[PDB]
Amino acid sequence: IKTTPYLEGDVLSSDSGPLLSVFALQEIMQKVRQVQADDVQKILDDIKALAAEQVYKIVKVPSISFRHIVMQSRDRVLRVDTYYEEMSQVGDVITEDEPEKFYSTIIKKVRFIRGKGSFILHDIPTRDHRGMEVAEPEVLGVEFKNVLPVLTAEHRAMIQNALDGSIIENGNVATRDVDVFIGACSEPVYRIYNRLQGYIEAVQLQELRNSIGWLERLGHRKRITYSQEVLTDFRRQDTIWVLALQLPVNPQVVWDVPRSSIANLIMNIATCLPTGEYIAPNPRISSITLTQRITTTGPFAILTGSTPTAQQLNDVRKIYLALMFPGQIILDLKIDPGERMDPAVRMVAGVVGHLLFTAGGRFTNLTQNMARQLDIALNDYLLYMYNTRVQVNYGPTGEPLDFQIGRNQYDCNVFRADFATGTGYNGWATIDVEYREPAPYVHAQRYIRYCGIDSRGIGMTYHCYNEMLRMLVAAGKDSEAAYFRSMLPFHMVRFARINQIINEDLHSVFSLPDDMFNALLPDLIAGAHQNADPVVLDVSWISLWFAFNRSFEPTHRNEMLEVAPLIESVYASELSVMKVDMRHLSLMQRRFPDVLIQARPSHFWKAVLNDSPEAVKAVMNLSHSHNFINIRDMMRWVMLPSLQPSLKLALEEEAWAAANDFEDLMLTDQVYMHRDMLPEPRLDDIERFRQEGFYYTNMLEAPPEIDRVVQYTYEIARLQANMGQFRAALRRIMDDDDWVRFGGVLRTVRVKFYDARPPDDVLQGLPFSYDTNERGGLAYATIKYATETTIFYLIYNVEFSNTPDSLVLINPTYTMTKVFINKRIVERVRVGQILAVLNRRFVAYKGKMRIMDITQSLKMGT
Amino acid sequence: DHRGMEVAEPEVLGVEFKNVLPVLTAEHRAMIQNALDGSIIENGNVATRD
Numbered sequence: 079i080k081t082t083p084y085l086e087g088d089v090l091s092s093d094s095g096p097l098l099s100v101f102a103l104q105e106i107m108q109k110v111r112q113v114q115a116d117d118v119q120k121i122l123d124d125i126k127a128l129a130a131e132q133v134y135k136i137v138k139v140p141s142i143s144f145r146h147i148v149m150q151s152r153d154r155v156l157r158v159d160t161y162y163e164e165m166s167q168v169g170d171v172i173t174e175d176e177p178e179k180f181y182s183t184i185i186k187k188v189r190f191i192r193g194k195g196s197f198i199l200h201d202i203p204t205r206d207h208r209g210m211e212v213a214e215p216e217v218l219g220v221e222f223k224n225v226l227p228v229l230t231a232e233h234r235a236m237i238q239n240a241l242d243g244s245i246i247e248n249g250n251v252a253t254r255d256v257d258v259f260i261g262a263c264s265e266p267v268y269r270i271y272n273r274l275q276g277y278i279e280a281v282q283l284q285e286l287r288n289s290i291g292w293l294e295r296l297g298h299r300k301r302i303t304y305s306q307e308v309l310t311d312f313r314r315q316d317t318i319w320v321l322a323l324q325l326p327v328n329p330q331v332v333w334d335v336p337r338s339s340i341a342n343l344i345m346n347i348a349t350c351l352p353t354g355e356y357i358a359p360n361p362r363i364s365s366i367t368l369t370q371r372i373t374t375t376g377p378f379a380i381l382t383g384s385t386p387t388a389q390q391l392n393d394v395r396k397i398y399l400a401l402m403f404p405g406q407i408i409l410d411l412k413i414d415p416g417e418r419m420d421p422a423v424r425m426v427a428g429v430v431g432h433l434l435f436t437a438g439g440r441f442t443n444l445t446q447n448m449a450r451q452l453d454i455a456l457n458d459y460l461l462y463m464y465n466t467r468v469q470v471n472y473g474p475t476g477e478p479l480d481f482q483i484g485r486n487q488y489d490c491n492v493f494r495a496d497f498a499t500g501t502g503y504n505g506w507a508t509i510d511v512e513y514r515e516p517a518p519y520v521h522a523q524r525y526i527r528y529c530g531i532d533s534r535g536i537g538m539t540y541h542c543y544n545e546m547l548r549m550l551v552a553a554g555k556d557s558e559a560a561y562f563r564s565m566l567p568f569h570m571v572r573f574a575r576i577n578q579i580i581n582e583d584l585h586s587v588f589s590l591p592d593d594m595f596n597a598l599l600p601d602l603i604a605g606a607h608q609n610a611d612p613v614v615l616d617v618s619w620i621s622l623w624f625a626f627n628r629s630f631e632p633t634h635r636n637e638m639l640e641v642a643p644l645i646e647s648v649y650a651s652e653l654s655v656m657k658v659d660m661r662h663l664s665l666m667q668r669r670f671p672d673v674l675i676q677a678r679p680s681h682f683w684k685a686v687l688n689d690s691p692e693a694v695k696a697v698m699n700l701s702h703s704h705n706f707i708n709i710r711d712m713m714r715w716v717m718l719p720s721l722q723p724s725l726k727l728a729l730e731e732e733a734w735a736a737a738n739d740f741e742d743l744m745l746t747d748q749v750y751m752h753r754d755m756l757p758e759p760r761l762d763d764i765e766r767f768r769q770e771g772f773y774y775t776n777m778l779e780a781p782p783e784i785d786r787v788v789q790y791t792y793e794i795a796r797l798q799a800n801m802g803q804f805r806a807a808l809r810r811i812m813d814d815d816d817w818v819r820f821g822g823v824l825r826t827v828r829v830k831f832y833d834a835r836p837p838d839d840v841l842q843g844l845p846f847s848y849d850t851n852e853r854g855g856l857a858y859a860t861i862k863y864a865t866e867t868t869i870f871y872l873i874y875n876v877e878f879s880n881t882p883d884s885l886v887l888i889n890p891t892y893t894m895t896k897v898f899i900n901k902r903i904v905e906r907v908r909v910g911q912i913l914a915v916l917n918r919r920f921v922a923y924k925g926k927m928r929i930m931d932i933t934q935s936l937k938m939g940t
Numbered sequence: 941d942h943r944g945m946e947v948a949e950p951e952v953l954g955v956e957f958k959n960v961l962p963v964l965t966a967e968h969r970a971m972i973q974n975a976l977d978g979s980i981i982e983n984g985n986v987a988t989r990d
Contacts, residue, residue, distance in 0.1 A: 177944065606988070676944030708990060709983075797970060856950065856958055 079633060082358040083365070085385045099351045099636070101392070102399055106344060109613065110704045124693035125348045128648050129641045129937060131691070133322050133726050134274065135197045136929070143264050144220040144915060147873060148228045149771045155225065157912065158904045161264040162829065165190065166744040169826040172864050174792065177677035181663060181685035183826065187743050188659075189689055192733040195270025198278070199922040200929060202257065204246065211246045218244070219262035220915060233909055240913055252279060253318060257922040262915035266736040273732040275921065277725060282321050289325035289933065296518045296643070302582055303635055308936060318929040322725040325933060327647045329521045329587045331654060331720050336711040339610045341701040342588040343406050349638040349645065350584050351402075356394065356628045359568035376464065377422035378558055386624045393621035397434075398630050400615065401576055402584075404441045404526070405595050410448045412616040419619075425462065427622040428455020432493060433546055433569070434626060436528075438500015440511050442599055445614065449495035453502065454478045460490060460553060468554065484552040493549070497603060504529060506542045522589040526580050528573045533581075535570065543569075572629040579632070583639075587646045611705050640939045651724040652694060658727065659686045660716055662734050670740070673747060673824060679712035741900065745824045748898035749845055749867060750782055750817045756841070756893045759874065761882060773873040778898035787817035792863050795846075799861040804848070820845050820863070827897060828868040833875050834884055840868050842894040869897045871904060946981045953979075 083092040095101075103118040147156040168190050170183040203214050226234070247258040263271070290309065297304045333342070358364065363371070364385060372383045386394070400407040431452040435443050444452075457478035461470075471487065473480035479490045493502040500506055508530045517523050529540045543566070550559045590598075594610055601607050638645070663682050667674055677685075687698060721727070737743055759772045788811060798804040812818065830840070847862035878885050923929065941947070964972065983990070 175941070177941070678944065797966075797973070800969070800973075801966065854958070856961070 079355055079357070079631060081355040082361060082628070083385075084391055085387055087387070090385075094355055095388075095391070097353045097634075098395060098399070099347055099353065101395060102347045102351060103344070105396065105399075105615070106340075106347075106613070107700070109615065110340070110700055114703050121693065121696055122348060124696060125345070125645070126638065128645045128691060128693055131648055132934075133196060133729070134320070136200055137197050138199075138201060139203075139217050140197070140199065140219055140261065140263065140920070142219060142221040143262060146222050146225050146912070148225060149773065149873070150769060150876065152230065152233070152909070154906050154908045155912070156904055156906050159264055161267065162744060162901070162903050164194070166827060166829045169744065169828070171866060172824065172826050173862065174675045174823050174864070177675050177681050178684050178688075180675055180824075181677065181682065182688040184663075184743075184745075185659065185685055185689045187745075188730075188733055188737055191266055191737060191743075192270065192729050195267040195733065196274060196729055197271065198274065199920070200927075201925045202922045204257075207242065212242065213244050213246060213259055215241060218916075220913075222912070225909075225912070229909065237909075237912070244916075251921075252281070253923075253927075255924060257924070259920050259922075260916050261918055261920040263918045263920075266733075266742070268918055269736045270729060270732060273729065274725075277728060278318075278320060283319070285321065285324065286319065286932075292326045292518065293643070299518055299585065300582070300639075303639065306640065306936065306939065308932070312932055314928065316926055316928060318923065318927055320929065320931050321933075322931070323644075323647055323651060323933065324723060325643060325647055327587060327643070327650050328720065328722060329519060329591075331722050332587060332646070332650050333521070333591055334715065334718050334720065335653065336707050336715055337611070337705045338698075338701055339406065339590075340613070340704045341697040342590070343403070343613075344697060344700065345646075345649075346403075346584065346586060346588045349588075349642045350586055350636055352579065352583055352632045352636055353634040354630045354632045356391070357631055358628065359565065374557070376557065377425055377459075377462070378561070380420070380422055381426050381623060384620070386620070390618065390621050390624050393617045394625045394628055396615055396617050397621060397625045398576075400443060400617075402579060404436075404443055405590050405598055406612045408443065408445055408612055408614045409435075409617055410445050410614055411451060412618050421458075423620050423623070424455055425459050427619045428452045429459050430626050431622050432456060432502055433504070433543060434622065436500065436504035436510070437495065438497050438503060439505030439508075440596060440599070441505075442497060442500075442602065444503075446495070446497075449502070453493065453495050456493065460549075466554065484554070486552070488548070488552045490549060492545075497599065504540075504542050506545070508541050517585070519585065519587055519589065521591045522585060524592055524595070526577070528577045529570070531570070531574060531577065533574060533578050535574065536567070538570065539566065568629065569626075575630060575632075579630075583636070586642060613704070641937050644933065644937070649694065650722045651726050652691060654722040654724065654727055655730050656686050656690065657716065657721070658730060664716070666740070673822065675823065679709055679716070683712055740824070744827060744829075746827060746897075746899060747821045747824055748778070748781070749820050749825060749827075750778065750787075750896045750898065751812065751820075751845075751894065752815075752817050752896060753812065754893045756887065756891055758887060758890075759885075761879065761886070764879060767879060768876055771874070771876050773871070775871045775904075776869060776893065776896050777871075777904075778896050781898055782817045786815075787819060789819045789821060791822045795861055795863060799848075800858050802858055804859075804861065823864060825864050825867060827899075828866065829903075830868055830870050832870060832872045834878070835887060836870070836872070838891075840870060842891065843867065845895055867895065867897070869899070942977050947977060947979060948981055950976060 080092055081094055083090045085091070100118045100122070103121065107117070143161060144157060144159050147158070149155070165187070168186065170179070170186065172180055172183060174180065202217050204211050205214050206212070229237070244259065249256060249258050294307070297306065332338075335341075368383055372379055397409070400409050428451070431444075435452075437444055437449060460479070460483065468483070471482040473482075473491070477491075477494065479492075479494050481490065482488065483490060495502050504510075510528070510530065511524050511526055513523055514525055531538065531540075547559060547562065550562065590610075597609065598612070601609060660679075660682050663686070667677070687695060757772070757774050759767055761767060795804070798807060808818070825845075830836075835841075843866070845863075845865065845867055847865050848859060849862070850859040851857070874885060961969070
């Protein structure tokens with residue numbers, strides 16, 4: 079099948095061009111850009127990638143959570159856990175001027191802790207020792223290699239045998255034989271691991287069967303194109319199922335989001351719209367000789383024989399998309415002052431739009447202005463007389479069609495547009511919507527049928543067409559009477575095909591709810607849309623004629639259709655996660671008022687939407703750019719009860735519960751200032767320095783005293799900066815040799831280790847920035863209260879004593895801000911209890927177990 | 941945004957006082973700033989518009 083030819087500039091062509099879905103994406107995006115104005119493949123595969131989203135990371139060996147540093151000794155070494163390092167380095171700079179940045183950084187912290195927490199063990203390595211199975215050293219949570227050569231005496235033997243004694247244990251959990259042993263792991267990630275294992279040991283095979291049944295129900299509804307079941311091979315006992323998602327999604331949560339009509343429409347386009355070709359009623363009639371086609375004289379005769387170009391092709395597919403989506407797409411004319419053409423084209427458009435479009439009844443496809451223009455055009459046609467002069471009997475007013483025509487007085491005033499019943503269009507006294515059986519989606523019960531016909535017809539007519547022929551035979555225009563009488567079947571089959579496309583392919587969770595579809599028209603006639611918003615598109619004049627003389631024939635189905643329930647369920651789960659994140663942000667905000675910075679629901683929504691899948695971000699951004707919201711919508715939407723439970727939701731809630739101690743999130747306010755002369759090695763006698771070594775840090779091991787300390791809140795800092803005595807006050811009060819505190823807000827602290835002398839910035843930075851704006855200003859020099867601050871551990875390489883050029887600080891200097899923390903991080907501990915972290919119960923599955931999830935593995939589609 | 945509430949910049953107010961900033965004391969400038977920053981912006985409706 080190839081589309082009928084359309085002329086390209088000067089040469090005919092028959093190329094189908096870009097896909098209809100891509101065209102719809104670009105048209106909607108360009109329209110909303112025009113709306114705001116005062117990437118289609120990227121967004122499409124951005125939608126696609128939602129399917130391959132995976133929540134848990136299957137791993138061979140758990141990540142190393144500890145490491146060691148040795149300094150020229152046998153008794154004690156430093157131990158450090160890499161969890162705090164990784165959590166501290168993933169942060170961002172904080173200013174209280176930008177609560178959106180503040181809460182986006184908090185959200186990044188919580189998302190990092192969840193993602194690092196979710197993992198599981200499958201195929202850990204095993205070794206043998208005297209008939210007892212032992213775990214190899216590399217699967218442990220603690221890695222040490224440097225301590226082995228430096229250690230001596232029997233300590234090496236008594237750590238080697240303790241390492242060897244890490245025997246495996248066999249136990250009978252509900253999935254029969256597994257492997258149990260002991261390991262070392264930092265706290266919050268292992269709390270997440272415990273939560274995940276507790277979910278995994280729960281059994282929901284009945285829920286799996288319910289999901290399977292819903293899939294088969296939807297499949298036999300979509301029996302035209304959906305046929306996929308691999309059920310026969312799943313039933314092996316040597317397997318594990320992971321149900322990270324519940325498949326029977328609830329459409330209420332996805333339709334509760336304010337002003338999401340545009341996003342739902344664009345996602346329906348993304349995942350359901352098919353691709354077709356445009357065919358004439360009779361193929362190849364365009365290539366016959368023109369003298370045959372232009373038979374006689376008249377407006378219709380002049381119009382016939384014309385050929386369309388790319389502009390009219392695009393407008394015709396725009397018209398067809400409007401037909402495919404009645405409740406969201408409305409049309410109007412593209413009127414410009416530069417128009418000039420023969421009136422016949424507008425005349426025919428007014429004649430034919432009455433049959434082509436539907437209005438009144440329960441749904442409308444046109445604006446009042448467009449219906450009025452079509453009506454006045456048909457008035458012009460009915461008054462246009464060029465063969466025969468007939469009697470006319472006008473009415474009291476100058477309204478269009480307010481007259482009586484024909485040898486018998488037959489009223490044409492009915493076709494004047496009225497949205498109450500739709501007398502002039504295909505909603506005139508004919509049913510269009512009905513109900514047959516309960517749908518798999520509980521909000522889309524309706525069946526939408528065009529011209530009252532059903533797919534499950536030769537020569538059948540309908541009321542509007544019969545009355546149009548009555549009008550035309552009363553007007554005595556027998557040429558086009560016979561023309562339309564012959565052209566009936568093409569119209570009927572095209573509308574049957576369109577009917578099939580809506581009633582079969584488009585059934586998804588994103589379809590408009592029945593009550594809102596019924597209430598669309600009353601909102602349109604009222605003029606105030608408190609509930610939902612459709613979109614209007616512009617279309618030219620001859621596009622109507624060419625739409626009537628073309629059709630739509632599907633050729634390639636939507637690729638997204640196979641995994642559409644999966645992607646929409648992932649979307650719902652993500653949306654629920656954002657909702658609960660907003661909730662818990664508000665709860666923590668009430669929990670800590672004295673140090674957190676007050677924000678609004680708009681700031682909270684932006685912060686939560688900042689960290690989100692890219693396709694979801696794009697569709698929300700487009701929807702909100704088209705239509706706006708306020709604080710009332712956010713406070714209303716955060717109070718709605720419905721939620722979509724998921725493993726992602728459970729992990730998010732457990733991550734927040736383990737992150738309740740915000741001090742553990744590498745966020746604090748215990749930064750202080752006291753000058754200390756920077757310690758340096760004496761570097762005089764080689765042997766004693768080689769034996770001793772030196773390390774230093776700006777860590778406060780203990781909190782400072784209640785006295786001999788002053789505090790600086792942000793408001794006092796700002797007032798002192800505008801005073802201009804800020805530097806003088808600091809210099810005086812710290813010549814007084816006192817501590818000074820920068821409390822009031824949360825500061826992000828980085829951590830770094832150094833084996834040499836670092837640059838002066840991290841040696842002696844300040845907690846703030848101080849910029850002196852130009853003289854004559856209102857506020858004078860300004861203070862940025864919070865900037866980059868780093869806790870550092872310096873441990874020199876004692877070998878570098880040969881080349882002191884990289885270690886000597888040239889001139890003695892003062893050290894700067896100190897940091898106080900409560901959590902244990904870097905510890906000089908004796909070598910005996912280096913293994914005292916081996917305290918948490920690791921569990922692993924057997925190698926022969928097959929742990930695939932059937933719902934995600936079903937995506938292959940072959 | 942001050943303390944999380946929306947306040948307009950001091951220039952939109954039709955008062956010019958830049959010439960008397962350096963002559964006031966600490967307390968006087970403190971109370972002037974405290975009085976100024978409290979002028980919040982309120983949301984309202986005019987002809988069904990926000």
